[PDB]
């Protein structure tokens, strides 16, 4: 982002301008829709707008009942999914979140017992917003929505009297497809994904009920201001569970993430093979420490794979369920004289292949066996030819790099790039410490 520093000593790059936010825990939220006594009244006079929608609502209720009854069947002491519908349904939630689906499900078992939902309904009798405590000390924020029940009951049964249906209106029929949209989409999502939706949508929680349910958590005044502006990524990392249909209401829960850390410097380290130690003797080194890094409490957290973290410009949305704690002396491998303080793992072996590693600001390229690799752009097709490798090139100097008729694009972001002068590694590198470069 802000500054990239090139290191000839080990052929690596570091970008040091990323403020970060790390997830810490989950905040739950229990809803309760209303559909009312739609199952009782019947429409049996001509096919028209009202007739074709009542059957839709009743069929949706039937499908929701079937999928809720089938939801308490998959929980056969299952913890490791071994089915196509479940393995492919658990990877879209995030591998690091697979340990969070279990926590949500275990919370679901507590709240679907008797005398638990009874408390929730009692807590919502007079108001649509009432925080309630569970039996095991956990606090649950309960939200109630009553759009249909205040439409099916008070100003629908009058119109449909004596089963002389569909005749005495042409406008209320249009409104019956207005209040009915949310419930149909909710049941469709839950029946399509077996009750475990992959992310919140504007059907589970509208934009009004997300800003109100994020300013009711107990948090600082900065973690709230950050969420009320990153509510897109908040929606992207929270999943909703299904509790069931208890009579004529739909109860489900939705898990909102909590950002425990809001500002702390972070950096990316990216590497590629080192050198032609001796022309024909291609025995050169390779850092295997790439990934992310962030500070939380004076102990840097390390994510070995870059897919575990995202980016929204400066802010970095990592998580603390897959982080690996490293000593805060790990930043000393960037000034490499083969220091014995922190043993850098790096690697060992003699099979160097030409590689390209895309950097946030520039790009780094290595060509060893004499492959025709050339710097390219848009205004000029071929600008210059480079020799050997580890020649880091900016994204202002070049716009594409070509290696074995395979082009790579470069980013347009701008930052104060830096280069650290240093001699590359020599023929013999013994004092480098001991990694495990296998598997």
């Amino acid at each position: 982002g802000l500054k990239e520093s090139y290191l000839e000593e080990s052929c690596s790059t570091i970008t040091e301008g990323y403020l970060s936010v790390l997830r810490t825990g989950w905040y739950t939220n229990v809803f309760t829709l209303e559909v009312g006594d739609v199952e009782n009244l019947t429409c049996a006079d001509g096919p028209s707008l009202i007739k074709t929608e009542l059957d839709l609502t009743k069929s949706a209720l039937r499908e929701l009942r079937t999928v809720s009854a089938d939801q308490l069947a998959r929980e056969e002491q299952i913890e490791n999914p071994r089915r196509r519908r479940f393995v492919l349904g658990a990877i879209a939630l995030g591998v690091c979140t697979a340990a969070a689906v279990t926590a949500g499900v275990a919370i679901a078992k507590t709240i679907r017992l008797e005398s638990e939902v009874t408390a929730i309904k009692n807590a919502l009798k007079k108001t649509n917003e009432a925080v309630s405590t569970l039996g095991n000390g956990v606090r649950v924020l309960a939200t109630a929505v009553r759009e249909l029940k205040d439409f099916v009951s008070k100003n629908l049964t009058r119109a449909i009297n004596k089963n002389k249906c569909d005749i005495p209106d042409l406008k209320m029929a249009v409104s019956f497809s207005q209040f009915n949209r949310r419930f149909l989409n909710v049941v469709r999502q839950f029946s399509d994904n077996a009750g475990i939706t992959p992310a919140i949508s504007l059907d589970l929680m509208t934009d009004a009920e997300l800003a109100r349910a994020v300013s009711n958590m107990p948090t600082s005044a900065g973690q709230i201001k950050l969420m009320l502006e990153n509510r897109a990524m908040v929606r992207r990392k929270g999943f909703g569970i299904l509790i069931g249909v208890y009579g004529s209401s739909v109860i489900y829960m939705v898990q909102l993430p909590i950002f425990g850390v809001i500002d702390t410097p972070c950096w990316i380290v990216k590497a590629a093979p080192s050198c032609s130690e001796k022309k024909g003797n291609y025995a050169c080194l390779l850092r295997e420490d790439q990934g992310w890094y962030c500070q939380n409490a004076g102990s840097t957290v390390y994510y070995p794979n870059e897919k575990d973290c995202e980016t929204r410009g400066d802010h970095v949305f990592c998580d603390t369920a897959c982080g690996i704690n490293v000593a805060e002396q790990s930043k000393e491998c960037n000034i490499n004289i083969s220091t014995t303080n922190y043993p850098c793992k790096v690697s060992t072996g003699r099979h160097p292949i030409s590689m390209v590693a895309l950097s946030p600001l520039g790009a780094l390229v290595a060509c060893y066996k004499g492959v025709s690799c050339s710097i390219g752009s848009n205004r000029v097709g071929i600008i210059k030819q480079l020799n050997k490798g580890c020649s880091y090139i900016t994204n202002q100097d070049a716009d594409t790099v070509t290696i074995d008729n395979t082009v790579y694009q470069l980013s347009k972001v701008e930052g104060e790039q830096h280069v650290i002068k240093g001699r590359p590694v020599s023929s013999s590198f013994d004092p480098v410490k001991f990694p495990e470069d296998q598997f």
């Epitope: 403020l19 810490t24 900065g222 809001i262």
Partner: antibody
Framework: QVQLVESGGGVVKPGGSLRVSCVVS????????MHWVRQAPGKGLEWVSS????????NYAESVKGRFTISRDNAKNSLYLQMNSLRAEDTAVYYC???????????????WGQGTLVTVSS | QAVVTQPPSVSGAPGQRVIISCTGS?????????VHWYQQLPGTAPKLLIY???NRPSGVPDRFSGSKSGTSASLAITGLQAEDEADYYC??????????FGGGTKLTVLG
């Protein structure tokens, strides 16, 4: 080993200015939010300011809003508290306290500094 | 919103039990936010006594215990000595006032 030293206290006329500092030592300064807590002579403690770990979100108390300004220097290990238009009801003792939190609902100032005194009289 | 209220002074006798209360309101302790206790000696800076409403940082001599429930918190000092004469403040978090401090009570031993 954590040790917070503040300096800059003195006597200043009403409607003046004064810049209090605080130097940290023994821990990573660029990872902790830091506060400024003041205590009138013989009264209870009161919170004054706060700045996150990278000078992004800054919160001021209600009575000092529009007159103070907190800053940081993550490389020189200090945080500063500019004052302006001081009044006679401002004299107090200022502490710089590191910030501790558990993540969700617990917030406390654990390693308080030493403290400096600011006298403001005509 | 509202401020945290504490009794002015508390008197005790050696070897007895002392209870210090910290009464909150509906916006700071009613929203599940902590109560934190600081002991200020007559000449020094405050030091942490209890964090998280029940825990103890290393150094506190195991005779200080706390409890929070609803909109109140309490501190219990078992076997009061002659060296525990100080001021005790209770700290929370309020929704609209970012950090609220209590008035502060002073424990006086009658030996």
């Amino acid at each position: 080993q954590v040790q917070l030293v503040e300096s800059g206290g003195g006597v200043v006329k009403p409607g003046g200015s004064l810049r209090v500092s605080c130097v940290v030592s023994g821990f990573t300064f660029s990872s902790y939010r830091m506060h400024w807590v003041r205590q009138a002579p013989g009264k209870g403690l009161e919170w004054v300011s706060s700045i996150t770990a990278s000078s992004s979100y800054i919160n001021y108390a209600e009575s000092v809003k529009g007159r103070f300004t907190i800053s940081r220097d993550n490389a020189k290990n200090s945080l500063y508290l500019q004052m302006n238009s001081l009044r006679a009801e401002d004299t107090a003792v200022y502490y710089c306290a590191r910030d501790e939190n558990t993540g969700i609902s617990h917030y406390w100032f654990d390693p308080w500094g030493q403290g400096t005194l600011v006298t403001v009289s005509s | 919103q509202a401020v945290v209220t504490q009794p002015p002074s508390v008197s005790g006798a050696p070897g007895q039990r002392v209870i210090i209360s910290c009464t909150g309101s509906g916006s700071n302790l009613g929203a599940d936010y902590g109560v934190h206790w600081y002991q200020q000696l007559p000449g020094t800076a405050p030091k942490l006594l209890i964090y998280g409403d029940r825990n103890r940082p290393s150094g506190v001599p195991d005779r200080f215990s706390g409890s929070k429930s609803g909109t109140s918190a309490s501190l219990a000092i078992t076997g009061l000595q002659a060296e525990d004469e100080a001021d005790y403040y209770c700290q929370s978090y309020d929704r609209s006032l970012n950090w609220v401090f209590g008035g502060g009570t002073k424990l006086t031993v009658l030996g």
